[model samples]
Target chain A: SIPDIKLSSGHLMPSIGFGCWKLANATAGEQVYQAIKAGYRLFDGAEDYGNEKEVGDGVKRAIDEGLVKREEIFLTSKLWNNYHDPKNVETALNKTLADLKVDYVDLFLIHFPIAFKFVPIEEKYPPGFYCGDGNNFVYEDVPILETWKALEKLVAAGKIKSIGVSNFPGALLLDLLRGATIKPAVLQVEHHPYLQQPKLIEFAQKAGVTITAYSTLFAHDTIKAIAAKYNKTPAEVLLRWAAQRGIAVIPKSNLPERLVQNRSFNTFDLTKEDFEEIAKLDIGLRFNDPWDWDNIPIFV
Target chain B: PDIKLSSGHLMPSIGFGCWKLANATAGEQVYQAIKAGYRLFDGAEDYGNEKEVGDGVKRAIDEGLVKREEIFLTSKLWNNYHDPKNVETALNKTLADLKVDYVDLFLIHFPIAFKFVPIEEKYPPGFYCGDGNNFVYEDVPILETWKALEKLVAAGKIKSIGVSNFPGALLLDLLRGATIKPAVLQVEHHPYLQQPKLIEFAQKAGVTITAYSSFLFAHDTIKAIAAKYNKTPAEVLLRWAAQRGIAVIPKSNLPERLVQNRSFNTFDLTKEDFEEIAKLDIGLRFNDPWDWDNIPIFV
Candidate 1:
């Protein structure tokens, strides 16, 4: 097991987690259950991920089957963009709790720096890009600090154990850090061998902010479909890369072998040649582009 | 000449200007400004002279004649470092250059776009222009640049924040959108032509003004001011701007005039003096470098 990071709230968090992105309802549940059975403890979910109910069921079943205690599991959720108004922040977070069957999530995050308009579950599940009109996809409004102030207050109420941000640039993060009374615990970005996000990570570190890695495995089935055969899974190599930097990593998979592989994923002892090979992979890669993330105006 | 900054700090009625006078003794030039009683010294990482400027400050301070805190030092965050992550590294470079722990104020040097460069580039002064070639620009906006400056203030690296050369319309929008009001706006203010309309707009916005290029009025734009003030073009231009509550500084390397140009503080111009100077708006600008044509949405 990897070591835990101490949040400003004083709770510890695991350094590696199982991410759920491409899985469907049942598939996501199966992966979560398998991960718990394989000794994984951290599960990262989001309103944007659309399988919270399934993920929760998997965790509950694991608890019922005596695989792991409820307290041992770490669950995370996020506030969607349309819900950026201060008044709606709690409501959105509570909905995530109710859907996940948890009283409070271990961590809550502003999913992406670019705020999108929050789409009600009644309107659309996961709300990745649900805008005013079903057809309107770009976020176009909402200043970052406005939404951040709302998130800061949620921390005071204990609805989320820790507050964090994702997909933010250095300037945006610095500006947020400048006005914040409570510093964000972690900054999750699209980190892979191809897009190492070096300067961004270094800046956050010096600022006393921690980092988390998403899209870690380049070898996951979804990635392998589009990846060159010449390359190994970007996920396996990159997760190790992030883990070395003290950034938490969440690698997703539904296959049993892959789930075990992700849980038991270890950092590679990269030589100078290996490090150089991985460094050359950074060719402006981005799995989630927020230039299109505009339904919620107060994006990071 | 009597106008003061938002922080109640005093700036000279006329200050020496930098920009066109590149690749020379910038440290000596800034020291020269100090010796000439010009307190507001503007420098930026992009100008490439923080080290020499710091050297000049060190020599002056080592003499033990003047206290360091008495001087108002200004520097800026560059475009490449505008990505919030680079704020500290950028500020540290400035601190090492000026050889100070902090600056009184740090401005967002420009709102235009430039490409990101790594810290290992060994750039004490920033590489905004990128090897004298204009190929690295990404055209990022004013707000993105302003965000980094906001971070600097939080880090305690600077005391106050301001903008330079920002046009009227953009400054108007920025003021409306800003939560913390801008303390000052450094623009191209001069005599052969006062940006009468622009300066008037900024005045009501509560932004203190600093003027550059006061003597020549950018060569071509001085024609109207030359005719209206019924005096040598540069004098009428400087006097007209100083007359309006704006701080105007005329650059003159000539020894005799350099000592005496500070005496334009006699009295305020009549409404007629301002009107005549207003007529000098032939709209010619001398400081427009060729690279400026490609950098859009920033004036």
Candidate 2:
């Protein structure tokens, strides 16, 4: 059974969930329905992924067949960069809700701390880094706090149950903690053997915000040796290491067998020394940096 | 001659940085700095030269070189005084030491919040708490810390509020809750570490950038740029920052060097030369806390 972690907002979130980052539109719904039948309750989808509609279709079919109730399944979506303006925040979430075919999402995250220039739904839906001109990385003047306050109002209005941020740095998280009326419940960032982020994890978790790890696709030699000791895949050992550190993980796989193996993290416990060994593998490497896109070093 | 701030106050584009100023020479040098045409003094409680800096300002004011109103004074709330309750208490001590009614701008020194230590227990408590060798972080957030500075703005103790060593994300979050927008931002912006995106973000947000350690005196590229403009390496770098509308507070122990620091306003770098110098940005930071205990401030 997947254990539940308690959020500061007093809601229980599963320690493991399905990461829907590249889940294709063709099989997105079937994959979500299969995962739900396989006992996965949390489905992490985002507008940036452009696969929420099929995932929503799968959730709808599950409810229609009574495989799961709407309340029992936790669906997570994100507001993209173009919708960070206060006037565009709710309208952005409304599109996510509409795309997912749901009345309310269990969790909604600000896709990134950045606010790109707004591109209207009339212009383009799920605007991925496009402000108007094709592939132009123009930034808007909208502040992250202004966007967050807009999210807080949506949470009050019942469109989003819990609100959080992804790909955020510690300093900005400190900023949100100061200005936010409703503090962010979770901070989702890429965490793996290569980019363990010990200080960031300690600071965020200490501040009562849950840390969610994404993109465990990266690792190192020490983790490979540790994986051999556990007789499990390096991915499982890495996920188990994150689990023992009290953070949540969302590993995605197309195959049903790999999906079952992803949640079996509780079956083996890494030794404290082995866990610390994996932590020493942190080379400060990252994959999802926006700096490569247009020299926009958001993390630098 | 002066850069207008969001608070409607004006600060000289060129100022004197008060870090590492010796106690015996601080007042004299600060007086000399004012007489040499520096109209802004950047200082902090942890820099351990507030009394000397104030003495120099008082010396200049008494000698009729500059009035208190003419010179813009900027001080910072250190990490130890970050608790919302301690903000005023810290400012009062700075006022007492500086012998000033109010500072033109007050900045939160760093985003890191340390445990509060009383002025009586250990004055200017630095990274370490009063209890031996322990660098403790308080639970206070920059928002709460900034809120305290905001109240000081209306109270008339401070004309404007800003932050130092703030990244783009940290600064973005503070605006989410601030009643008064920051008037300025100071950071370690040299040629090697020119954060262009952060600079653009601050520009878009309408906050002024004040640069510390604003030069790379030694380098083939810098020297090459310096000779091309008939200026010294320091002058070339200082002008590079100043020409970009960033405020610079370069300090020098020698009087001749100090003159060179501020007197380079006559020549302007052409756009191509400016871009050529800006192209040297390798993201090399000399002031990272990560080097010292891996204290994640920039990240």
Candidate 3:
């Protein structure tokens, strides 16, 4: 396991983790098993990824083989947009649990700030951009506070260890802090050198929420110099940049060699000049914006 | 008469609009409005009448009707000047036209950005015009423009700053980066288009809402309720917004109507009247520019 960062919920989250997005179910279990063998303990998965069952299978394989215990793994999943209603929050988590074969996940996140019309389990699980007609997403009337309160209930009921949010803009996060009795433990977003979001990071740090970054590896030469200085790859340099800022970074890798390299990020250090060279590359570039989804501009 | 802003400034609750007031008669109409007990004057650079608006204020001050501190003045930064470098220049033009050293509240007219047109070519350009295209937008981000607005606040050119026509999501996006929190949010609100959720959210975030189109709800239902209460339909409409804790800028050319618009405190609407008016919300919007350049902004 990687070094741990203490969460506001009193849990120590691994500073380095594995992103389970786009992991094929055919090899997800084995890939996850290899990652566990390679010193990765935190597995970031979501219901929207459609691989929760495979992630659970991989964790189960490791546990059965006497390699690790369920308590040793830091498992995370997310509630989709379709199940944003306070009534459907628990049911959604339960569905994810059934698929992942776990009683509770270490961290649970709201997938997006916006909510879609409720789609039942029999109709479609983790419905994306489908509000019945499949052409447009009919926005649900559920306010964010309504959904946050529901997650708080899940915490009290012991269904989720800690609750956080993903893709929440700065103002919405502030508003949530204003009304939330249980402040979100983490805020996960698509963060990289090109989209540092410094103000948001400072705000979250002040608010006592850990910022976990995904999509840290953008195929660019922005970190080439720093990588060459330390005899590391640009991907490793990018991951280190986020980690150095007190952010937990989850970079995905399916190859065994890459998995080893990805977890070996704590070995090297970047000088202040190296960080400045990478900082100038910020052009407010966003690759995975919800605004591209049906042109709804979900993040605004 | 005064509403405390989140920026610690006091603004008059009911302001007079200068949107359609002709540049020729703007001075006389604004002077009369000031005499009729309107201390808040809402004007924008795009209105093309700030000079007259300023003339009215100048004459009123000369006659001892009001002082600069007594009157709450507002102007908007148009879309063509969303660039950070152009924000101060655009505001300087408005100040020169209005003949005022500073404005009480300055707002970004819209979320969209357009290409900057030089003031030497045309002062207060309403919208951008290119050789082949009528509307050419720029890629300047709103956060960049807001930072410039904060600089203006530090320079004492504007007392408070805000944004207009921003949806709930976009407004939250701005709040994350805003150092000087927006003091007021101006939007098109009426019984027909009561943005209840946005109102609640902005209030929670400490931004007071200022509602335009205050007379949009003077239909049969509103008229009947006004008749029952022995008040005019305009009074009922203005009161509905006030009861929701929203400020109003009711526009009128008639002196009696302007006086009536300010007399909303004379009577209060009953619970039955409020509920009946709330049911009339059909999400009707008259001045929607949603399809402007095929951007789908309101969506």
Candidate 4:
């Protein structure tokens, strides 16, 4: 099991989580079940992934066989862009809970801090990029702060233990903090050697929010070179580097052995020199940007 | 002279404000202002008499004194409507009250959000609500408001958008994420609150600063410098602001003062006069909204 870090929301979160993005539906349930058995306690899933049911089924299988109790597992899901309106927030969470067969999520995240016009519930559940038109997306007039207020109500209603944000830029984060009553507990971002985002990490840490890093497998050259120094795989070396910075890393894998290796990053440590070298490799490169859908290029 | 705004529009270097003009006298005063070479009219929904301001503009156009295109109008979105949904609704109401199709520039009144009141309830609900203590604070993020303001640009409702009373830290945060950069930043600037650092940063970021209260409380040295040039203290203050490449909006109900303000360009101040006036920077801020309802927005 990974060590627990205290969140600004006063909740303890595991330092590592299994990402469920791009997992094949046919084997997602079995792989997730294996990950649980391999001592992966945190499962990071989102409504946009379209595989929460399988992720939930795998968690159920582990709970049934006494691998771990539900309370011991930290499950997180994100609110999609189509459901950013306050009126649709509860219904969106209710649908996710129904699919997972769970009462509440440990942490609920506002997926992208951007809102699209609501697609009717009958159209599509997740409504992946289908803004009722072709590839064009119509943004909702609802403000991000309005949606945050709704999330605060959810915490009060016991539907979610804590709330945070993902993919928000530093300026937007500071702007949110100005009027935010319950500050976001965590800021999840893409993290790798080529995209260190040191300033954003430092800003969040100074403001008392934890960083949850995704996409830890990029910057192959540096990762591979560091891995060669310690007889470890590049993926393990990358994950350990993020872990060493006190960032909770979520690395996805379908392979049975790779799941064990992903969680075992805690077993070994990286030298300070290797860590500092990897930090210097930040070239401000980003692999995933939803702003590309609108041709906005907000984080170039 | 006009300054080119980032929104691809040009604004006159000087404007006339309608902050405290009496409703009965607004039409006549604004009409006289237009005759005195004032093209920009700065008004706000919180001023409580946009209809009178509209009446003045209509009377000026009726007499063929100036065409609508010759006048550049500006208004602000108040704190009560910072909620994204209410942003457009509030602006529409301002347009209806002002009797104008579009405003040349729109500004976020302040960097604060008050409790939201639906349009159906009342238009321009200035401060708190219901029981006087119903001052509920809503956590509406500033970026959300900025995004909505960006949409208004695409919708053709507002030609340009800007910010007022934003500090440097908050302005920097908005700049990092703004898609349609703010064309103008209006601040309570005079010798008392020059804000030299903010002016430099905003100008470097391609934003033009508009100084309000430019003549409200001129320092004794400024008044003395005006005597040297045989100009009123108001003209000296307005000229100082214009000389720095900053836009100025000084208001007066008196007819001769309006003409006097518009004629500052005729006289030029010496370099020694400019330096002597610059020494009056004591950082005195008069219009403090920090204690409004016990909410310290600036703190």
Candidate 5:
């Protein structure tokens, strides 16, 4: 029931929203539909999610049914590793638009700081880490600066409402800022209660960039790995904490009830005790490090 | 001779370690230590004894004994008050408490976050245990904290600003990012914790390092060094600090040892002795924070 905050770009964005990752295609659309019924307007999707079309269809269906307006909804998508080149940025955005059947996405992001060789859709569809035409690594010499410059042009041409980055560490962000002409409007990263990136988040806030947290719930796969420890449902505790801090939170869920639960964030108050306990949860855990990919070759 | 820190500042290698012994009469003891030849007096606004320290240092200076310029004094700015707006307030209060016109160097005590408490509640306001009962500001950035220290230096409130307890990476990054490069980095440097990688990293990056608790955390090491040299353990610890190009503060009210401790620059460690000490850099830590990993930059 809290109010939405306006971005420096003059677009009003809900400070809280639903994340759509690793959700089944059919269920992803349906849950999003259910969320719209529950008064959610922001729907987050990604190229890697393989459900942009489905998410788009869900949004379309909701709009057609008068559940919401196409203009009222803020839809987000991203440029994955295969599209980190300037030449490929438009093509990637077009494919997303064609698949989702939208003129423009509300926000577009460079999904990770690492840039790798661009792969064609026929070669490796949704190439999360795959870069080659077939069974081999595709190598490219494109830099992140080039990719960012390309995004800057697209923004100038009115193709994207805003451009930003994700999964970048503090030092990398600083380096990019030094080179950037237009400051990145947002930085999306893995921010959960246990892996609260205190210093990076602090720095980002000070720099006047908004932060978006993915895995607002600790990744389901990781919690299952560490199941032996006394574990709280990471989805609930983490998402609520992030939402409370005024950080934009996008938690993915397929269950109809979980979708509503994710939307109903408790923002009555976040205590300093709660903040420090969350800070203690940071033990240098990087759940989604792209450096693990071979032939990716981005981080030094 | 002084503590040959990498930055070229002349700190008395050893401080009279006073964290535990800062009682009512600590000032008179510090005064006596100075007369005995302890030229460098390391104290802080947080030590809650600036007045006592001021009393001690002023007493020594008043007698036309040791000129203020002949001594090296250092104090730390606490975490709870790290905003640039609070920097001068904290520095001026410390100046008032220690009864000195200026301090040689001021340090940002920790690479952690704390609330920006108003200066009215406490002077130098180091450890602010407020009604909220929490001591951290989870959302504020460290660079904001550094900016405040920078303000102090620009305003001539402190001669130079330094960092303390930050990892090597953070220190290096600050050197690169800072408008005014930090003059020194104060850290837990000792024989058992030589921190060669960190030390070399800082030196290579052009930031000087100051060592604290320098006697290998050897509970009896200071005492034993005293006996071997017919001096107090505190004096030996102080001497070892200067020899290693690190500032040290070993606490004691004893007269004879105070004289010996102040004379650290008189003795030098040989290449062999330095090498042996280098071998002791095992990367062990005697003091650590649970959330140290959450620090903004990589170490």
Candidate 6:
């Protein structure tokens, strides 16, 4: 079993959780079941991922075989951009719960800081980047705080154990901190060798938020060199680098071997010099910048 | 007509920006500008000339030229005062220097919060924490600074609260947490640096945009408009901003341009001319933090 870190809410989560993005719909359930067999306990999911039902099937299958209990599995889901309106927030969460076949999620996150115009669940299940039939994006005026307040109410009802935000800018997070009834327990963001937001991570960590990194690898000479020294892949080096800083890493691999290797990340420690050498490769590259969608610069 | 602020206060459509007024000339120029029919005076703690600016206001009052209530007085909370404890202490420093009991509007100078620099160390430490080159940062969130401003409003020290130099993103975050909705957002705006998205966000959010301007003499659109309207390039630029329902605050050393700057609102630009002026926008920013420590305050 991997190490588990305690959140501000006093709930412990595996530091080396498996992210469930891009897990093919057909294989997602089997991979999830395989991941659990390989010692993964955290299943990071979101509505926009479009594979919750399959992933939930894997969890259900794993539990049905008496491999793990429902309570043993740490499930996380995100409210999508289209579900940011306070009224739609719980509606979106309920669908995820139904898809996962669970009564509650261990953690629920706001997918992005930006809001998209609301689309009915009956019309669009996991509205990724569309407004009605067309892909034309329209921004909704629902403030992030309003959505957060809704989450707080959901927490009161015991539907969510911890609430957090993903892809939130530092300014917005700090503002939310000022108004949050329950301070954010975790922050999942795009953290890799290239786009390592050190200041933002430091600020959030100081404010009592655990960080979980997503999209954890980029090809680089320095990372490759460091990877060779550790007898690991560049992806593992990236994960270890973040994990050393107490920032959690969520790397998904359908391969059972990679799942076991990712879970075993805490076994080795990178030197301060190695971390600095890898950090120097920082070109501030971001893979998931929302700027391409509507020219709305989140990382700008 | 006045801009009805979300705070239920009336703000002038145009105001006198008191940035470059020197300690030697600020009082006289401010007094003369008031006498020339300017009712709004925008000053800030970072300007380092509030003493003279306040003296000008006092003299105008003594001479029966204007009363305190007749003028819409504005000041800003500098980066050093962003700490919750230091917020009021900073505003009081401005109040003491300006000789006013309360300001009509007090804006958080920048979204970037810096470590507290004492008044004794350096009164208006513009962008430094140490001996004028080091930029140390404070972790005080903008919401904490905003909450302090909200308290000032309840205490009657600031009639309205606003922010300056915040990007639409930061402003959106601030609005989510703000108990008192910001009434105005001041930014560097001209034909060359027209942030239409930020302006649009502010307008729809009910936050009035105050355009801080200059550098229009070189722009072809502004020059052509100035020639066609028989107005100075400066006047044309000021009027262009005013015509777009945004406030323009241009500082002037000369009394002639001061009066001219105030009266540009008396005329209007055609729809074609306004759109042409907007074409000069190249997303330029002269007061950028990127040129310094890359604060990304606008990001």
Give the candidate number with the greatest DockQ.
Answer: 2
The digit string of per-residue lDDT tens for model 2 on A1-300 reads 999988877778889999888888899889899998888999888998998889999999999999989988888898899998899898888888988998898889988877788998878877898888877787777767778889999989998889899999877786567668888999999887778778888878877999998873335578778888878887788788889889999984537788788897777888879977776767889888876776554686
lDDT of 1 by residue, B42-154 (tens): 67787677778787777777876356787677776766766556667788888988899888767766554456776576464344445564446543445556666666677
TM-score of chain A of 2: 0.96
Query: Candidate 5 lDDT, tens digit per residue, B91-198?
Result: 888888878888878888876656777667765555453545555553334566677777666676677678887764345445544777787887886667766666
The true-versus-predicted C-alpha distance at residue B274 of model 3, in Å, is 42
TM-scores computed on chain B for all candidates: 0.80, 0.96, 0.96, 0.94, 0.80, 0.96
Q: Which of the two, 5 or 6, has more lDDT? A: 6
Mark the regions of model 6 whose C-alpha exceeds 4 Å error after superposition. A132-140, A216-219, A252-257, B1-26, B32-40, B45-52, B61-72, B77-106, B110-161, B173-183, B187-299
Across A1-300, the per-residue lDDT of candidate 6 in tens digits comes to: 577889999999888888899889999988999888888899999999999999999999999999999989999999998988899899998999999999999999998888888999888777788877596888777777789999999999999999999988776776677568888899999888778877778778877999999873445678888888888887777778888899887884536667777777666789989978877877778888776677664554
The positional error of residue A231 in candidate 2, measured at the CA in angstroms, is: 5.9
- Docking category for candidate 4? incorrect
**How close is chain A of candidate 5 to the true chain A, as a TM-score?**
0.87
How do the residues B1-299 of candidate 4 rate in per-residue lDDT, one tens digit apiece?
Answer: 89999988999998889788788988878888888888898988878678888888998998999998899989999888888998998889888887888888989998777788776665557775533657655567777788998998898889889999886645655665588888999999887777787787788778999999733335578768887778888888889889889998875737857777777887877788878876887667776564464333332
Cα lDDT, all candidates? 0.66, 0.84, 0.83, 0.81, 0.67, 0.84
Clashing pairs in 6: none
Q: Pick by lDDT: which candidate is best? A: 2
- Candidate order (lDDT): 2, 6, 3, 4, 5, 1
In terms of TM-score, the best-performing candidate is 2
Q: What's the best-to-worst order under DockQ? A: 2, 6, 4, 5, 3, 1
Per-residue lDDT of B1-299 in model 3, one digit per residue for the tens?
67899999998888899988898999998999999989989999988899999999999999999999998999999988989999999999999998988999999998877788888877667655443458776666577789999999999999999999777776755675588888889998888787676787788778999999833345788989888888878888888888777899886748768788787877788889888888987767766554455333453
lDDT of 1 at B176: 38
- Judged by TM-score relative to the true structure, which candidate is superior, 1 or 6? 6
My TM-score estimates for the predictions, one after another, are: 0.53, 0.79, 0.57, 0.58, 0.52, 0.73
What TM-score does candidate 1 reach? 0.53
Q: What TM-score describes the B chain of model 6?
A: 0.96
